Amino acid sequence: RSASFWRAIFAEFFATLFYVFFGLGASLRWAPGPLHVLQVALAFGLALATLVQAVGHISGAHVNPAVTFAFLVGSQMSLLRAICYVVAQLLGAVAGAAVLYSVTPPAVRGNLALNTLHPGVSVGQATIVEIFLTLQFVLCIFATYDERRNGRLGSVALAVGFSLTLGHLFGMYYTGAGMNPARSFAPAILTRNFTNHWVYWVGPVIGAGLGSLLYDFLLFPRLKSVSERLSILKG
Amino acid sequence: RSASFWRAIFAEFFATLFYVFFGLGASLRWAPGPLHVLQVALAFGLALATLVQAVGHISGAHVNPAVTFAFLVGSQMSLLRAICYVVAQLLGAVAGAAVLYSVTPPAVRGNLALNTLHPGVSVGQATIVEIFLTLQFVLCIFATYDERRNGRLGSVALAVGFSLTLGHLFGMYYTGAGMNPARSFAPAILTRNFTNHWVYWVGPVIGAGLGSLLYDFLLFPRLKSVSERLSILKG
Amino acid sequence: RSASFWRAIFAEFFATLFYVFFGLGASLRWAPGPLHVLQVALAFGLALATLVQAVGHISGAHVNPAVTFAFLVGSQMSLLRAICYVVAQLLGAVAGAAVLYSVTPPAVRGNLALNTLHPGVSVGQATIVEIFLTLQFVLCIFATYDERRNGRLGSVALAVGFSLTLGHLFGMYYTGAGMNPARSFAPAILTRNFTNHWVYWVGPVIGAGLGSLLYDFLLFPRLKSVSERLSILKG
Amino acid sequence: RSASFWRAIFAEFFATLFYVFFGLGASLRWAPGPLHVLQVALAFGLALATLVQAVGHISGAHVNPAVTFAFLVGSQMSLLRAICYVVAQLLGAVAGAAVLYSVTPPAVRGNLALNTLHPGVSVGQATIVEIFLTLQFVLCIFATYDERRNGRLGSVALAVGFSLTLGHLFGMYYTGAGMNPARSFAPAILTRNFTNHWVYWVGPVIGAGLGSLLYDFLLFPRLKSVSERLSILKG
Amino acid sequence: RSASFWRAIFAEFFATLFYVFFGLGASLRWAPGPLHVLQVALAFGLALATLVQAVGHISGAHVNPAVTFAFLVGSQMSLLRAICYVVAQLLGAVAGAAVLYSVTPPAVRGNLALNTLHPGVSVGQATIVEIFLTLQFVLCIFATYDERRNGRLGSVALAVGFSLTLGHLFGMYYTGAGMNPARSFAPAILTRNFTNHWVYWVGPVIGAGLGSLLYDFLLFPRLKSVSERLSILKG
Amino acid sequence: RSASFWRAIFAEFFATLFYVFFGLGASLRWAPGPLHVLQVALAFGLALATLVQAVGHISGAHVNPAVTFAFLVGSQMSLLRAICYVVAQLLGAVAGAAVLYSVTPPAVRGNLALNTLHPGVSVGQATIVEIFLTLQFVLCIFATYDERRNGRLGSVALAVGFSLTLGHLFGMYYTGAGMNPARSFAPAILTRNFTNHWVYWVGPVIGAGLGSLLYDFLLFPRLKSVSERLSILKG
Amino acid sequence: RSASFWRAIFAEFFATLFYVFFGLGASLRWAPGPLHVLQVALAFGLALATLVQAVGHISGAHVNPAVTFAFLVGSQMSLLRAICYVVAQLLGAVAGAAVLYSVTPPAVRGNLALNTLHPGVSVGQATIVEIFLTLQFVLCIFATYDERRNGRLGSVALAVGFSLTLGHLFGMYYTGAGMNPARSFAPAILTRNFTNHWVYWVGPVIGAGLGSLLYDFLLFPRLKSVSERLSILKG
Amino acid sequence: RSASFWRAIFAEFFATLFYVFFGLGASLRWAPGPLHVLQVALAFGLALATLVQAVGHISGAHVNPAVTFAFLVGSQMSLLRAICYVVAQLLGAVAGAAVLYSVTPPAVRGNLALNTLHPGVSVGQATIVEIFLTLQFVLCIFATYDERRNGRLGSVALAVGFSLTLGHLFGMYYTGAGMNPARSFAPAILTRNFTNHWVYWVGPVIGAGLGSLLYDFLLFPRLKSVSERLSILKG
Structure with missing residues (x-):
């Protein structure tokens, strides 16, 4: 039972590793002509x-660092298990960014698709955008998994796929698509470049937390015990 | 039981707010090259x-003002609850349009993607187009929710997503994509500009009503009591 | 019970009318720049x-004339009911083509997206292409509806949507996308132009028949009575 | 019972034949302008x-040669049945490539979309890419079919469709999209051209095997008997 | 002295032959993506x-049939010499169209770039456009050659090149670029297709005549003898 | 001698009429894909x-209203002759705009290429841009005609052509290309629309005057009599 | 006087070296989107x-190997001087191709823009195209230099520039632009690849010879002594 | 005579100011779609x-800092006059860059078109490219002005225009177009960013010097006195 918990860490490590490899790989600058924004955005989504x-x-299958915290603040996971996924995700993100680098040609690779802030957009506007991108993403994943609803949601996994597709397509223009610290983290480190890299952690975390609370405190609450459930933290 | 009814108003307010923010945000003029019509259209759909x-x-989860009335005329909702969603949607539409404005750069924003009537297209032709766009959309949402059918419709939510994708892609060319008063409403007000803005309310409402009746009076009727069901209006 | 059979004719009439209006409307020549083939193809699919x-x-929900015959040859429908859908579909196709014409501007409309044979492609090569396009489409629809399989096919309706997306995207290049007589029929009549218009009826019908038999005589047979089932023709 | 096993060989032959015809047909060089990579990639996915x-x-419905072995190494199929699908797939791949050739015009066809290695990319980098492309694809198909999980995966068939869409979109740039020996095989033979054609067999096979083991030995094991199950090989 | 007159007929035959081969060759349909209108237009100009x-x-070096008449009506050439250039030009146009056909692939060639009238544009609007295109072209060539002006016109030959570039770029949209009967003539005959082909002869001839008179009767007259010069017709 | 002065008015009327017809005609909205800015810009230049x-x-051959004043302030023309060209140019501009309207289809024509101010650009920034566009244009035309310089300027007429090409290409982005009141004037009147239309008169006039003085008072002065030359105004 | 002849060899060596470096450099594969054919073609022309x-x-300033022979067959140069330019040109072509290789990134460079024969085009059709491309080019250069004509040809050097622009733009599609052995020679050798490389020598040489004779034996002969001039060969 | 020397400094100041304003203004990032490389490159050329x-x-009219030195090393100008142009050019470059900044919107402007080194290209490869770009440019300007040659060079000013067009079009890809310190200087200073900015000074200066010597010591020497001419330095 103890070791089984560890495999989940692998699922999260491999999942994120692949997530960053395919999507970030999709961004690679070789589009000067068509608007690869449709492509890159579409790639992150199918990957997810x-x-x-x-x-x-x-x-x-969180994959997204900001999304994992959403579940933790969502009150339904151990504080340690949460920390386990974040480190598995960051390392997974870099493991992927590392390989993508080795395989793509020099002229092809630039900064490995480093989240570049859009000329006109200011730092404050870039944060709010990140706030809304993750909020919708988290709100989507939260409902999808919500057992309470049997209904006919259909391919719950595919549902999440498109939800992310929306965030990236839009996100791509304002803040070179973010809504995921892991995605923003790999390019900066694997290419010694840290700039506004914090807005990316700040918006998604706020967004995730905000989006998480919105589903609970309001939208679709847990008709049981709020104070009692918060015991998961103690194990 | 009384307050619970109010949360639904929030779901509709937040849903529309996000709906207008992501899709209208997608339209933003920065495509002069590729035909963003594929993008913008695709955005409204994934958003929905x-x-x-x-x-x-x-x-x-109506989101669309014209679509809400479809359900009301569809005979299965209180007249007050209907009015509650429309105001929650319009305000939600503006709340989103308001934020999108603050975040996008000056050069980027134009009229915040104001439904511009296509050069050649006349006002009459623009209305019929709007009539058909909503009719198909409403007809799709109506069936999707129809409990009667268990079958294997699959992701009922995703089904609706693509249905709207079709309306916007086509709608984008003739009337700068409409089929939703909320979508048309936010740009006009948040950018003091009212022109043909009525064709947008006129076509979708007629379309919604027409599309709603088509599913009932004909297609797949309610094998129970038509006169009895109309009692929902009285509560 | 007698009149109820007639409503199905309406479903088929309205379905096809909308099918031709949205997809054929999507083709309208105003893309000279991006390769609308992605768009037009995508449109027919979401429409379906x-x-x-x-x-x-x-x-x-056959919509496609060639597809209806597939079910008839598929042995599971009355010969009259089959004829009822074809006429409902052709008229439905024209009803849509008629309205699309009235609404689109002169410069916009050309031949209303008349299936134009590709310069190099010969008439024989154009037929085989049509043969394969419908075969896959019919084979997809046949399985989708096959009750026998409970499984987890998921959104059976969405499944069919993409299947058609494939046919049109490919079909668009060789024979200006066909695989549907109704689609080919409306533009020719609503714009007095008949040329190779037969290859379109010939390939899809052969394809549909061929594709239909493939699923039965081989692939996934009906483990019951082949000779007995053929009694549906007599009612 | 003996002959029934043979029909499966046909399903695999026809499936692959169609797979190569539609996707490889989609690649045909006539895009010099838009970045057909979005198209071609999208085509292989919908086809699958x-x-x-x-x-x-x-x-x-394996279709992919490398994917079939994944199931065999996956321990749940007869060694002979595995060999039956591979030959049915290769022949099916060529049968399709053969027809595509006859139908497309001379100027249109080039090498029938022969997997051309990307200028800068070296042979070693091309292999690893192929390794990862199939690993994710196999891992996706494996889970999709995994009975153990009832859940709400939704359209299991559509899920696989997009998974492949990702591999090809990305694969298209580095190694002209591979991740499938059959796809790489048909163009080389139907157009006497063999170059690096082995990297394609090498990466997908390694990838498939690797991806297959990852799901079993780790991720989601078979809580029964590993040594006992390996008896399927003996029949 | 008699035979020397004949060489001029060759210069006109070869010039036009090359003119139609390069420019019409430039039109060949293989641009679906970029707007080859910039290309095709640019080609006719550099060719000229x-x-x-x-x-x-x-x-x-008239090359253009309508342009030759401009000089004849311009009063400064023998009526026979005028007829000699027209036949040398038409034959030259076809000689070129004939070879272009033999060399370009089947899929490439369509109607050999047959002047296709633009969907919306009517026959009357198409004529006026042709009227203005040639008028400016003739007016440009007339001044360029006008000995009277020594000045510093510079590359008189290059001047004419761009003047034509303007006519075709604009002409390309309304009437698939015309302003030259020879250009319109070759595709129609070398591809049995005659439709509106007369508007092309009608507009350029009227335009040429009109443009020719404008330079004389008004703009820059011949300060000598108008009635006396008209004796060139008699030899 | 008196009437001869009048023909110059015709040259200016026809020249501008053609100038507005070809260039403004080039702008017509049918480029949504390629960046017609290269085209439209290129068109105005070849036209000039x-x-x-x-x-x-x-x-x-001034054609440009702002450019004519440059010559008048340039001290070398009668005040009346200056007024004669401006009215001949404005009328010429409209005469052209009038015909372009009648010939282009409804869907094609919008505002007849009305100088639309760029979203982000403010009114003040739009004026300075216009100031610099005309200054360079006037400075170019002034030198070109300057008899004093024999040298080898070459095609003086072609030189001016490209100079204008630069102004429009750049001007097109900030203020929808202006640098010419006539160009800005025709669309506004022939399509009842006056907005910021003054910035266009203001910048080019200031620019022309400024650019004119720069060549004289500084750059290449008139080594004769400044006070004496100013007598041309008196005739 | 003896050494001075040698400097001409340098002019030809440097000229060609630069010619191949800039134009071939322009071809480099990084355009997948816009149709660089406009670019590459335009580059070779401005370079020339x-x-x-x-x-x-x-x-x-011949630069082109086939063009040098045109002058030799043109009867006005020593047989040795002709051989001197060809070797200076080929070496110059490679010297340029050598440097271009060292400077461009791996992923960027492919075959250094190796003249690739167009899919559909056959070897015979490829030769005739090359025949006509050089004929017009040679005929243009021949006239340009022809002292006999004083006139106002203008920028004789610029005239030749556009003439070549035409050949390459057209040539680019059929035979990946040739009309110059040097251009075809450098990529093949600097990238061990020889295929159809002869059609390139064959067409341009035939074309050059043919084009050269056309200007003399016919068009504009040398009104002096044909047999006497052929003495230049003897020195 | 003393003050007259100063006006030349103004011509150089205004010329460069305009040069940087129009060309650098042309670069402004708003092309993501078409390959503005054709545009930007074309702009710098027409501007020059x-x-x-x-x-x-x-x-x-040097405008280019590296080009001015070419003339100084070219032996035909005072050492002080050379220094006068460089400072007039740098200030002129900034004066232009300063205004371009104030007029373009925030989102539009990025780094004001800062010469960004191409991902794959290394610093050494970037220098050689700059070396060759200026060499050809200087060699072109040198010949153009060379009085010795009367001939028919034509528009000497236009000749230089295209020569630069070539350098920038090619230069744009490898080193974001340089060949001019002034062009590289303005963006770096007006946007506090200095990186590899030296390669730009290093290549053009070496190139200019090298290109200058090539025309003299070899190509077309000065058949007079080399040692005597070097007296201009002393005045």
Whole structure:
């Protein structure tokens, strides 16, 4: 029972590793002509849509650092397990960024698709955008998993896939698509470049927390015990 | 039981707010090259597809003003509850349009994607187009929710997502994509500009009403009591 | 019971009318720049994907003339009911083509997206292409509806949507996308132009028949009575 | 019972034949302008998504040679049945490549979309890319079919469709999209051209095997008997 | 002295032959993506700019049938010599169209760039456009050659090159670029297709005549003898 | 001698009429894909380059209202003759705009290419841009005509053509290309729309005057009599 | 006097070296989106236009191997001097191709823009195209230099620039632009690849010879002594 | 005579100011779609082509810092006059960069078109490219002005215009177009950013010096006195 908890860490490590490799790989600058924004955005989404199928089955499939905290603040996971996914995700993000670098040609690779802030957009406007991107994403994942609802949501994994597709397509223009610290983290480190890299952690975390609370405190509450459930933290 | 009815108003307010923010945000003029019509259209659809998952679960997820009336004329909702969603939607539409404005750069924003009538297209042709766009959309949402059918419709929420994708892609060319008063409403007000803005209310409302009746009076009727069901209006 | 059979004819009439209006409308020549082939193809698919949800529930949702015959040759429908859908579809196709014409500007409309044979492609090569396009489409729809399989096919209606997306995207290049007589029929008549218009009827019909037999005589047979089932023709 | 096993070989032959015809047909060089990478990639995916619906129902629907071995190494199939699918797939791949050739015009066809290695990319980098492309694809198909999980995966067939869409979109740039020996095989033979054609067999096979083991030995094991199950090989 | 007159006929035959081969060759349908209108237009211009250098030196370099008449009505050439250039030009146009056909692939060639009238544009609007296109072209060539002006016009041959570039770029949209009967003539005959082909002869001839008179009767007259000069017709 | 002065007015009327017809005609909205800015810009230039050849020979060839004043302030023309060209130009501009309207289809024509101010650009920034555009244009035309310099300027008319090409290409982005009141004037009147239309008169006039003085008072002065030359105003 | 002849060899060596470096450098594969054919074609032309100014002044400026022979067959140069330019050109072509290789990134460079024969085009059709491309080019250069004509040809060097622009733009599609053995030679050798490389030598040489004779034996002969002039060969 | 020397400094100041304003202004990031490389490159060329007409007449028109030194090393100018142009050019470059900044919107402006080194290209490869770009440019300007040659070079100013067009088009890809310190200087200072900014000074200066010597010591020497001419330095 103890070791089984560890496999989930692998699912999260491999899932994120693949997530960063395919999507960040999709960004690679070789589009000067068509607006690859349709492509890159579409790539992150299909990457996430599929990972959810292989990974989520085993355990979670969060992949996104900001999204994991959403579940923790969501009150339904151990504080340690939360920390386990974040480190598995960051390392997973870099493991992927590391390989993508080795495989793509010099002229092809630039900063490995480093989240570049849009000329006109200011730092404050960039944060709010990140706030809303994750809020919708988290709100989508939260409902999708919500057992309470049997209904006919259909491909719950595919549902999440498109939800992310929306965030990136839009996010791509304002803040070079973010809504995920892992995504922003790998390019900066694997290419010694840290600038506004914090707005990316700040918006998604606030967004995730905000988006998480919105589903609970309001939208679709847990008709049981709020104070009692918060015991998961103690194990 | 009384207050619970109010949360649904929030679901509709937040859903529409997000709906207008992401899709209208997608339109922003920065495509002069590729035909963003594929993008913008695709954006409104994924935005709607996802909102249906988070919002619909709690209550409705109509988002579209013309679509809400379809349900009311559809005979299965209180007249007051209908009015509650429309105001929640319009305000939600503006709340989103308001934020999108603050975040996008000056050169980027124009009229915040104001539904501009296509050069050649006349006002009459623009209305019929709006009539058909909503009719198909309403007809799709109506069937999707129709409990009667168990079958294997699959991701009912995703189904609605693509249905709207079709309306906008086509709508984008003739009347700068409409089929939703809320979508048309936010840009006009948040950018003091009212022109043909009525064709947008006129076509979608007629379309919604027409599309709603088509599913009932004909297609797939309610094998119970038509006169008896109309009692929901009285509560 | 007698009149109820007639409503199905309406579902097929409205479904096709909408099918031709949205997809053929999507083709309209105003893309000289991006390769609208991605768009037009994508449009026919979403149009079909959605119609299946509203229409199929009530009855069939074939929409495609060649596809209806597939079911008839498929041995599971009355010969008269088959004829009823074809005429409902052709008229539905024209009803849509008629309205699309009235609404689109002169410069916009050309031949209303008349299936133009590709310069190099010969008449024989154009037929085989049509043969394969419908075969896959019919084979997809046949399995989708096959009750025998409970499984987890998921959104059966959405499944059909993409299947058609494939046919049109490919079909668009060789024979200006066909695989549907109704689609080919409306532009030719609503714009007095008949040329190779037969290859379109010939390939899809052969394809549909061929594709239909493949699923039965081989692939997934009906483990019951082949000779007995053929009694549906007599009613 | 003996002959029934043979029909599965047909499902695999027809499925692959169609798979190569539609996707490879989509690649045909006539895009010099838009970045058909979005198209071609999208085509292979919808082609696979749909085949899974018609073919998988009858038996398997692997289509991909490297993917079939994944199931064999996956320990749950007869060694002979595995060999039966590979030959049915290769022949099916060529049967399709053969027809595509006859139908497309001379100027249109080049090498029938022969997997051309990207200028800068070296042979070693091309292999690793192929390794990761198939690993994710196999891992996706493996989970999708995994009975153990009832859940709400939704359209299991559509899920696989997008998963492949990701591999090709990315694969298209580095190694002209591979992740499938059959896809790489048809163009080389139907156009006497063999170069680096081995990297394609090498990466997908390693990837498939690697991806297969990852799901078992780790991720989601078979809580029964590993040594006992390996008896399927003996029949 | 008699035979020398004949060489001029060759200069005109070869000049036009090359003119139609390069420009019409430039039109060939293989641009679906970028707007080759910039290309095709640019091609006709450089083709004309250069021919003027090799051909004009020997004799004339009119190339354009409508332009030759401009000089004849311009009062400064024998009526027979005028007829000699027209037949040399038409044959030259076809000689070029004939070879272009033999060399370009089947899929490439369509109607050999047959002047296709623009969907919306009516026959009357198409004529006026042709009227203005040639008027400016003729007016440009007339001044360029006008000995009277020594000045510093510079590359008189290059001047004419761009003047034509303007006509075609604009002409390309309304009437698939015309302003030259020879250009319109070759595709129609070398591809049995005659439709509105007369508007092309009608507009350029009227335009040429009109443009010719404008330079004389008004703009820059011949300060000598108008009635006396008209004796060139008699030899 | 008196009537001869009048022909110059015709040269200016026809020149401008053609100038507005070809260039404004080039702008017509049908580019959504490629960046017609290269085209439209290129069109105005070739249009001007050629007019200079036919028109300038007879008299002036200013075409641009702001440019005519440059010559008047340039001290070398009668005040009345200056007024004669401006009215001939404005009427000429409209005469052209009038015909362009009648010939282009409804869907094609919008505002007849009305100088639309760029979203972000403010009114003040739009004026300075106009100031610099005309200054360079005037400075170029001034030198070109400057008899004093024999040298080898080459095609003086072609030189002016490209100079204008630069102004429009750049001008097109900030203020929808202006640098010419006539160009800005025709669309506004022929399509009842006056907005910021003054910035266009203000910048080019200031620019022209400023650019004119720069060549005289500084750059290349008139080594004769400044006070004496100013007598041309008195005739 | 003896050594001075040698400097001309340098002018030809440097001219060609630069010619191949800039134009072939322009081809480099990084355009997948816009149709760089406009670019690449335009590049070879400006490269040639300018070289003619620096190089031609000193001696010749042929640059093109096939073009040099045109002058030799043109009867006006020593047989040895002809051989001197060809070797200076080939070496110059490689010297340039060598440096371009060292400077461009791996992923960027492919075959260094190796003249790739167009899919559909056959070897015979590829030769005729090359025949006509050089004929017009040679005919243009021949007239340009022809002292006999004083006239107002204008920028003789610029005239040649555009003439070549035409050949390459057209040539680019059929035979990946050739009309110059040097251009075809450098990529093949600097990238061990020889295929159809002969059609390139065959067409341009035939074309050059043919084009050369056309200007003499016919067009604009040398009204002096044909047999006497052929003495230049003897010195 | 003393003050007259100063006006030349103004011609150089205004010329460069305009040069940087128009060309750098052309670069502004708003092309993501078409390959503005054709545009930006074309802009710098027309900007230079025209300035040469207004400025060169008065004095020089060098505009390019590296080009001025070419003339100084070219032995035909005072050492002080050389220094006067460089400072007039740098200040002129900034004066232009300063205004361009104030006028373009925030979102539009980025780094004001700061010469960004191409991902793959290394610092050494970037220098050689700069070396060759200026060498050809200087060699072109040198010949153009060379009095010795009367001939028919034509529009000497236009000749220089295209020569630069070539350098920038090519230069744009490798080192974001340089070949001019002034061009590279303005963006770095007006946007506190200095990186590899030296390679730009290093390559153009070496190139200019090298290109200058090539025309003298070899190509077309000065058949007079080399040691005597070097006296200009002393005045």
